[PDB]
């Protein structure tokens, strides 16, 4: 059977490998419009920060055309799919070097076209001093342009802009970080967490320009100035846009069911509204467990799992999607910040009524020769007491705790469950009750009044 | 109503505090045979290893007679409960300073009498150069007296013995570690984990004397010679016995339902077979989730949980025990070793049929400036694919991953759930799939091939 995979980074690479693994009757073709596949975008900030082995971006690839071709896939780089017609099971594809366009049939189509960076329709985006940050070629451009810059402006303080700002400030660039929200990582963490980060930014010489969106760029002399709606004008050698992503799904607009942003809605086996077209990764919606609904959560975690499920379910509905909790994290200036599920910002934006407790405790006993404060939040349903989300931050790497809370959320466990569930004690690791147990107990006490 | 707590370390302290917080009409008396309460025995190896603040063991106490008295408890230290008579609801109590005995009534009795050290009738075990290691007074004695020794022998390589060998090996004593098993931590971790620990012991000068039990001790001059069955004679200045514990439960032998070893069987609200006598901690059996049955898992985690449940359930059946998974861990020479649930050694002892996979992966990508291998095992039920246990070890602190597996066991999650459940990705922490996901995927691959 003929299987065509459109796009080959995280989701497409996994879909190809799992398909070939489980269906030796599959003749697979991958179309990718870039001149590369299988590049780890999630390593870009460490690469630009000069914090990967030998500063060598070859180590950020987890596959290659030769590897996939030896599995037996027909890998066609610099090829752009320009049409999909679900009713006839055909696509049109353009060779980008020769401009030659061909229509071809498929038995199954896998839409792993991901997302593109959001580029706001404002003056100056065409400047050679404005940089995107999504893919290998973007990364290479930034890494090569670094020696010619001493001042960088980063627009957008989501996960990517937060990491870049840290990465450039640790190399003694002058850094400006600009966002329309009044806090960094506004949608991602409570104020008690982002206040800590802001303090660290200012201690490392980062100029935080918060509360007004960028309205324009203007290239003048060997610099660009970034201009906010409220009148500020910020000069740098270069500027980097980090204001999010949108599903790359124009090919299927009006043809399969989608969220308002274009994310392809799928059943539990990764089929779109058309049975022979699968979607996975940043092209697709996820089943979000905390609100039992479809959501857009463009993370590599979802790309690899969705890609895997496409391969598993290619011919048969064999393995249901477990859904996801938006588990994510970062480490900035040595401090870990992790979260899973819902937070109070996202609850307010969606008119959900939730409860939350915020507590701080040393992760292990004070009699130890060292310990560190862990700041913790737990978000739960006031009526069912089911856990809906949580977040932790410490100088100690508490990241694996977000995975504990993710499993709680997956099983719809309550604050009462978390309060008492067995967790190991040894003073090198924790107090007799683990800090997650203590968090649950604090939520219980709040709920009981 | 009159509440009597017998024994006051982990379980008894939690029981007293929770009881008083939830039951203003409880009139609590606490009897403790020792001259101290509320000491953290789980801190002794760090104290003895000079790895706590100011090497001050007062920092290991989580309560005090003054604190419990201010809450309204009548704290009676150096008092031993010598009899419990359910038929009259009375106990007998000896004052250990004066030898006087008095009888009193109870409405509720809370048996938090814990465990006592196993001491077999091995000849010479009585010697003044043989030390126990259970409580504050044992620890204080070792802290005072070990510096006089050049060579320390540790008998028993379970959790305590292993910790003590590490602690003393880092202060440049000669250390012998003796055990009847062929591997350190035999009961607790697979060989793949314990081979690593053994070489670390050896590289820090610890002499491992494995495979033969101690048969006799002999005191000669100012030394003690420990003699194994196989003919080895191990000379040292002192010996420390770390060969386990048993329930301290003679007061109720023949009076309430127990396991063969004396552990008091309770219902989900911590009642013994006698409605007005509760049990919590090392005196009690746990509800062990992996086998869905009663077991003896003497850990602080169970003591604090069971003590809390006694206080919550003192007058009304309010909160059910969720049971436990035997989650435990050590950090030895900077390496984390953690476990939850069943292991293959334990299954093989109880005739349980399980499957297990063991894999090793770097915890985070190889392009990072550094990463560390994490060695991992997962035990699961071949018929239901349900997770029954797991273990991890790494130079990176992967301890909280054992708690992820604990929560999976709690919920009877399968290897297939573990393979795909959402866990975060950032290259500072892990690969796109977390090492635990990778573990579940390995278990899936094994289970699928074997049919
Ligand atoms: C800088 C950065 C840091 C990130 N950090 C993290 C992190 O730490 N953890 C985490 O979990 N996630 C992180 N993310 C998100 C994560 O990288 C994405 O969710 C993931 O890359 C999505 O993978 P994908 O395969 O769905 O899509 P994409 O990576 O978007 O790849 C889609 C591919 O499809 C190709 N394509 C598109 N249209 C066509 C067409 N018409 N014809 C042919 N080919 C086409 C594109 O060229 C591209 O190669 C980060 C993202 C970025 C940009
Ligand atoms: C050295 C060591 C290290 C350990 N490490 C860990 C670890 O890292 N993590 C973990 O989870 N667990 C660990 N444990 C186990 C943990 O300490 C025990 O599970 C816990 O102490 C048991 O608490 P308890 O209150 O049940 O009993 P116990 O601490 O044994 O206390 C019972 C009390 O009852 C008193 N008593 C007994 N009989 C009478 C009587 N008749 N009258 C009056 N008083 C009486 C005793 O004097 C004692 O004070 C360790 C144990 C030791 C000894
Ligand atoms: N025009 C703009 N000027 C400044 N900030 C903007 C602008 N447009 C969007 N943003 C900000 O960019 C961020 C969007 O990034 P986000 O998608 O949430 O994270 P990430 O890009 O790392 O996935 C938000 O904090 C938002 O306020
Ligand atoms: N006579 C003996 N000689 C040497 N080792 C012994 C002897 N008796 C018991 N042991 C060992 O003592 C160890 C006790 O450890 P265990 O009870 O399982 O953990 P813990 O440190 O909590 O006490 C066991 O490995 C057992 O082999």
B399 touches chain A (CB under 8 A): yes
Bridge-based pairing state of the strands A238-241 and A245-247: unpaired
Q: What residues have CB less than 8 Å from A383, skipping those under 6 apart?
A: none
Which of B46, B367, B376, B437 is the best mutation test for A, with the most CBs of A within 10 A? B367
Q: Give the experimental resolution in Å.
A: 1.8
Q: Provide the shortest C-alpha distance from residue A126 to chain B (in Å).
A: 31
Which of B426, B436, B449 is the best mutation test for A, with the most CBs of A within 10 A? B426
Q: Provide the shortest C-alpha distance from residue A360 to chain B (in Å).
A: 18
Angle subtended at Cα A344 by Cα A395 and Cα A167, rounded to the nearest 5 degrees? 40
Instruction: Dump the DSSP string for A261-279.
Output: T-PBP--TTSB-SSTTEEE
Cβ atoms B336, B393 nearer than 8 A? yes
Half-sphere exposure of A299 (CA within 13 A, CB side): 27
Q: Enter the DSSP assignment of A253.
A: T
Nearest to B303 by CA among B17, B12, B65, B73: B12
List, as ranges, residues 328-367 from A with C-beta within 8 Å of B. 328-331, 338, 340, 365-367
End-to-end CA distance of chain B: give it in Å, rounded: 60
Minimum-distance CB partner of A329 among B327, B424, B433: B424
Number of Cβ within a 10 Å radius of residue B369? 9
Minimum-distance CB partner of B427 among A43, A304, A403: A43
Q: Residue B176: left (phi > 0), alpha (psi -120 to 50), or beta?
A: beta
* Domain ranges for chain B: 1-33+62-114+247-327, 41-60+115-245, 335-447
Residues recorded for chain B: 451
Q: Enter the DSSP assignment of B122.
A: -
Method: X-ray
- Structural Rg of chain A based on CA atoms: 23
Per the annotation, does B10 bind a ligand? yes
Nearest to A425 by CA among A360, A362, A372, A364: A364
The ligand placed nearest to the CA atom of residue A280 is 1
Residues recorded for chain A: 449
List, as ranges, residues 18-57 from B with C-beta within 8 Å of A. 40, 42-43, 46, 51-53, 56
Q: Provide the shortest C-alpha distance from residue A383 to chain B (in Å).
A: 18
Instruction: Dump the DSSP string for B99-151.
Output: --EEEEE-SEEEE---EEE-----TTTTSTTEEE-SSHHHHHHHHHHGGG-SE
Cβ atoms A394, A375 nearer than 8 A? yes
Cβ atoms A112, A15 nearer than 8 A? yes
Task: Give the C-alpha separation, B2 to B107, whole Å.
Answer: 5
Which chain B residues are within 8 Å of A305, Cβ to Cβ? Answer: 420, 422
Per the annotation, does B214 bind a ligand? yes
Nearest to B341 by CA among B289, B293, B384: B289
Nearest to A427 by CA among B59, B296, B394, B147: B59
For A85, the token pair is 């017609």
Nearest to B234 by CA among B243, B224, B242, B244: B224
Q: What residues have CB less than 8 Å from A156, skipping those under 6 apart?
A: A178, A179, A241, A242, A243, A244
Indicate yes or no: CB of A423 within 8 angstroms of CB of B403.
yes
Which of B407, B430, B447 is the best mutation test for A, with the most CBs of A within 10 A? B407
For A324, the token pair is 């996801």
Task: Give the C-alpha separation, B307 to B111, whole Å.
Answer: 10
Q: Do the domains at B1-33+62-114+247-327 and B41-60+115-245 have one common CATH topology?
A: yes
How would CATH label the architecture of B41-60+115-245?
A: 3-Layer(bba) Sandwich (3.50)
For A382, the token pair is 């006031």
Which residue bears the tokens 């392009």? Answer: B367
Ligand 3 atom at shortest distance from the alpha carbon of A161: 22
Q: b/e per residue, B354-368, with b = 16+ CB within 10 A? A: bbbbbbebbbbbebb
For A39, the token pair is 């590049």
Q: At what angle do helices B191-203 and B159-169 cross, to 10 degrees?
A: 30
Q: Which residues pair with B263 in a beta bridge?
A: none
Instruction: Dump the DSSP string for B241-274.
Output: E---EEE--GGGTTTS-B-TTSPBP--TTSB-SS
Q: What stretch of H or E contains B27?
A: strand B27-32
For A195, the token pair is 């206040």
Indicate yes or no: CB of B59 within 8 angstroms of CB of A367.
yes
Residue B283, Cα to own-chain centre: how many angstroms?
A: 13
Question: Taking CB atoms and a 6 Å cutoff, what residues make up the pocket around ligand 3?
Answer: A 120, 155-160, 178-181, 186-187, 213-214, 242-244
Bridge-based pairing state of the strands A90-95 and A79-85: antiparallel
B61 touches chain A (CB under 8 A): no
- Say whether B83 sits in a helix, a strand or coil: strand
Number of Cβ within a 10 Å radius of residue B23? 18
Instruction: Dump the DSSP string for A30-47.
Output: EE-SSS--SB-GGGHHHH
- Say whether B304 sits in a helix, a strand or coil: helix
Q: Enter the DSSP assignment of A135.
A: S
Number of Cβ within a 10 Å radius of residue A31? 24
Cβ atoms B83, B92 nearer than 8 A? yes
3-state helix, strand, coil in chain A (%, to 5): 30, 30, 40
Task: Give the C-alpha separation, A407 to A417, whole Å.
Answer: 12
Q: Enter the DSSP assignment of B225.
A: E
Sign, CA dihedral B348-B350-B355-B358, equals negative
Q: Which of A118, A134, A158, A227 to mutate to test the pocket of ligand 3 (most atoms within 8 A of CB)?
A: A158
Instruction: Tell me which chain B residue has its CA closest to the CA of residue A288.
Output: B422
Q: Enter the DSSP assignment of B212.
A: S
Cβ atoms A402, A329 nearer than 8 A? yes
Half-sphere exposure of B187 (CA within 13 A, CB side): 14
Q: Is B123 exposed, middle or buried (0-12, 13-18, 19+ CB in 10 A)?
A: exposed
Across the beta sheet with B373-380, what order do the strands follow? B328-332, B335-341, B387-394, B373-380, B355-362
Nearest to B344 by CA among B192, B211, B213: B192
Which of A60, A339, A424 is the best mutation test for B, with the most CBs of B within 10 A? A424
Bridge-based pairing state of the strands B286-288 and B277-279: unpaired
For A348, the token pair is 């307010």
Which residue bears the tokens 């003694």? Answer: A172
Task: Give the C-alpha separation, B161 to B132, whole Å.
Answer: 11
Task: Give the C-alpha separation, A151 to A129, whole Å.
Answer: 12
Task: Give the C-alpha separation, B271 to B247, whole Å.
Answer: 17
For A147, the token pair is 């020696």
Q: What residues have CB less than 8 Å from A131, skipping those under 6 apart?
A: A138, A141, A142, A145, A238, A239, A240, A241
Cβ atoms B51, B143 nearer than 8 A? no
Task: Give the C-alpha separation, B78 to B199, whole Å.
Answer: 45
Nearest to B404 by CA among A421, A321, A387, A432: A421
3-state helix, strand, coil in chain B (%, to 5): 30, 30, 40
Q: Enter the DSSP assignment of B211.
A: S
For A149, the token pair is 């810059």
Q: Enter the DSSP assignment of B358.
A: E
For B359, the token pair is 């894999």
Alpha carbon nearest to ligand 1 atom 35, residue: A7
Q: b/e per residue, A69-91, with b = 16+ CB within 10 A? A: eeeebebbbebbbeebebeebeb
Nearest to A223 by CA among A143, A141, A138, A148: A148
Calculate the dihedral angle through the C-alpha atoms of B290, B292, B295, B300, rounding to the nearest 10 degrees: 60
Task: Give the C-alpha separation, A404 to B250, whole Å.
Answer: 40
The ligand placed nearest to the CA atom of residue B40 is 2
Cβ atoms B208, B201 nearer than 8 A? yes
Calculate the dihedral angle through the C-alpha atoms of A309, A315, A320, A321, rounding to the nearest 10 degrees: 30
How would CATH label the architecture of B335-447?
A: 2-Layer Sandwich (3.30)
Which chain B residues are within 8 Å of A436, Cβ to Cβ? Answer: 403
Which chain B residues are within 8 Å of A430, Cβ to Cβ? Answer: 399
Cβ atoms B83, B91 nearer than 8 A? yes
Q: What residues have CB less than 8 Å from B117, skipping those under 6 apart?
A: B132, B133, B134, B241, B243, B244, B245
Which chain B residues are within 8 Å of A338, Cβ to Cβ? Answer: 424
Q: Which residues pair with B111 in a beta bridge?
A: B6, B279
Q: Looking at A342-401, which runs of residues are DSSP E strands?
A: 355-362, 373-380, 387-394
The ligand placed nearest to the CA atom of residue B109 is 2
- Say whether A53 sits in a helix, a strand or coil: helix
Nearest to B390 by CA among A31, A407, A386, A44: A407
Q: Enter the DSSP assignment of B157.
A: -
Task: Give the C-alpha separation, A82 to A441, whole Å.
Answer: 55
Number of Cβ within a 10 Å radius of residue B128? 9
Q: Is A268 exposed, middle or buried (0-12, 13-18, 19+ CB in 10 A)?
A: middle
Q: What stretch of H or E contains A233?
A: strand A233-236
Which chain B residues are within 8 Å of A428, Cβ to Cβ? Answer: 46, 329-331
Minimum-distance CB partner of B421 among A322, A331, A366: A322
Across the beta sheet with A206-210, what order do the strands follow? A130-132, A238-241, A151-155, A174-179, A206-210
List, as ranges, residues 274-333 from B with C-beta within 8 Å of A. 289, 299-301, 304-305, 308, 319, 322-331
Q: Which of B5, B12, B41 to mutate to test the pocket of ligand 2 (most atoms within 8 A of CB)?
A: B41
Cβ atoms B198, B206 nearer than 8 A? no
For B445, the token pair is 């691959």
Cβ atoms A393, A337 nearer than 8 A? yes
B215 touches chain A (CB under 8 A): no
Task: Give the C-alpha separation, B433 to B423, whole Å.
Answer: 7
CATH superfamily of this structure's domain B1-33+62-114+247-327: FAD/NAD(P)-binding domain (3.50.50.60)
The ligand placed nearest to the CA atom of residue A80 is 1
Instruction: Tell me which chain B residue has its CA closest to the CA of residue A286.
Output: B422
Q: What residues have CB less than 8 Å from B260, skipping those under 6 apart?
A: none
Which residue bears the tokens 């194994």? Answer: B228
Is residue A10 flagged as an active site residue? yes
Alpha carbon nearest to ligand 3 atom 17, residue: A244
Nearest to A102 by CA among A80, A73, A87, A77: A80
Q: Looking at A11-112, which runs of residues are DSSP E strands?
A: 27-31, 74-76, 79-85, 90-95, 101-105, 108-111
Q: What stretch of H or E contains B302?
A: helix B300-312
Which chain A residues are within 8 Å of B408, Cβ to Cβ? Answer: 407
Indicate yes or no: CB of A425 within 8 angstroms of CB of B42.
yes
Task: Give the C-alpha separation, A445 to A385, whole Å.
Answer: 12
Q: What residues have CB less than 8 Å from A414, skipping those under 6 apart?
A: A380, A384, A385, A386, A387
Task: Give the C-alpha separation, B407 to A116, whole Å.
Answer: 37
B433 touches chain A (CB under 8 A): yes
Cβ atoms A264, A282 nearer than 8 A? no
Nearest to B430 by CA among A364, A53, A338: A338
Known binding-site positions of A for ADP: 159-160, 179, 181, 188, 214
Our answer on whether the CB atom of B246 is closer than 6 Å to any ligand 4 atom is no
Which chain A residues are within 8 Å of B301, Cβ to Cβ? Answer: 422-425, 432-433
For B182, the token pair is 């062929």
Number of Cβ within a 10 Å radius of residue B17? 21
- Say whether A17 sits in a helix, a strand or coil: helix
Nearest to A31 by CA among A90, A88, A113, A141: A113
Q: b/e per residue, B191-230, with b = 16+ CB within 10 A? A: eebbebbbebbeebebbbbbebbbeebeeeeebbbbbbee
Cβ atoms B236, B149 nearer than 8 A? yes
Known binding-site positions of A: 9-11, 32, 81, 115, 134, 159-160, 179, 181, 188, 214, 282, 300-301, 425
């Amino acid at each position: 059977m003929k299987v065509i995979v459109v796009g080959c980074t995280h989701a497409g690479t996994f879909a190809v490998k799992q398909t070939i693994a489980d269906h030796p009757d599959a003749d697979v073709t991958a179309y990718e419009m870039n001149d590369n596949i299988s590049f780890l975008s999630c390593g870009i900030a460490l690469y630009l920060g000069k914090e990967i082995k030998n500063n060598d971006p070859r180590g950020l690839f987890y596959s290659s055309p030769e590897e996939l071709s030896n599995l037996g896939a027909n890998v066609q780089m610099r090829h752009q799919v320009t049409n999909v017609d679900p009713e006839t099971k055909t696509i049109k594809v353009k060779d980008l070097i020769t401009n030659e366009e061909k229509t071809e049939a498929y038995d199954k189509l896998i839409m792993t076209t991901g997302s593109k960076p959001t580029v706001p329709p404002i003056p100056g985006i065409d400047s050679s001093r404005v940089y995107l940050c999504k893919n290998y070629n973007d990364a290479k451009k930034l890494f090569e342009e670094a020696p010619k810059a001493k001042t960088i402006t980063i627009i957008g303080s989501g996960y990517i802009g937060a990491e870049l700002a840290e990465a450039y400030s640790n190399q003694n660039y002058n850094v400006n970080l600009i966002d329309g929200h009044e806090r960094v990582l506004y949608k991602y963490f409570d104020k008690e967490f982002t206040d800590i980060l802001a303090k660290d930014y200012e201690a490392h010489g980062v100029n935080l320009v918060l509360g007004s969106k960028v309205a324009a760029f203007e290239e003048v002399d060997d610099e660009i100035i970034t201009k906010t709606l409220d009148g500020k004008e910020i000069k740098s050698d270069i500027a980097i846009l980090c204001i999010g992503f949108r599903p790359n799904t124009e090919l299927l607009k009006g043809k399969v069911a989608m969220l308002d942003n274009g994310a392809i809605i799928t059943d539990e086996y990764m089929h779109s509204s058309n049975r022979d077209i699968f979607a996975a990764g940043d092209s697709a919606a996820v089943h979000y467990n905390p609100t039992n609904s479809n959501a857009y959560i463009p993370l590599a975690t979802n790309a690899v799992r969705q890609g895997r499920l496409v391969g598993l379910n290619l011919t048969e509905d064999k393995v249901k999607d477990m859904g996801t909790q938006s588990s994510s994290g970062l480490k900035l200036y040595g401090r870990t910040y992790v979260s899973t599920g819902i937070n109070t910002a996202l609850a307010k934006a969606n008119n959900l009524k939730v409860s939350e407790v915020i507590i701080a405790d040393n992760y292990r006993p004070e009699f130890m020769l060292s310990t560190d404060e862990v700041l913790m939040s737990l978000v739960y349903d006031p009526k069912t007491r089911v856990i809906l989300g949580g977040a932790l931050s410490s100088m100690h790497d508490v990241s694996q705790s977000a995975n504990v809370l993710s499993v709680c959320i997956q099983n719809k466990n309550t604050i009462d469950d978390l309060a008492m569930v067995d967790m190991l004690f040894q003073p090198q690791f924790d107090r007799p009750f683990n800090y997650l147990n203590i968090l649950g107990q604090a939520a219980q006490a709040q709920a009981d009044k």
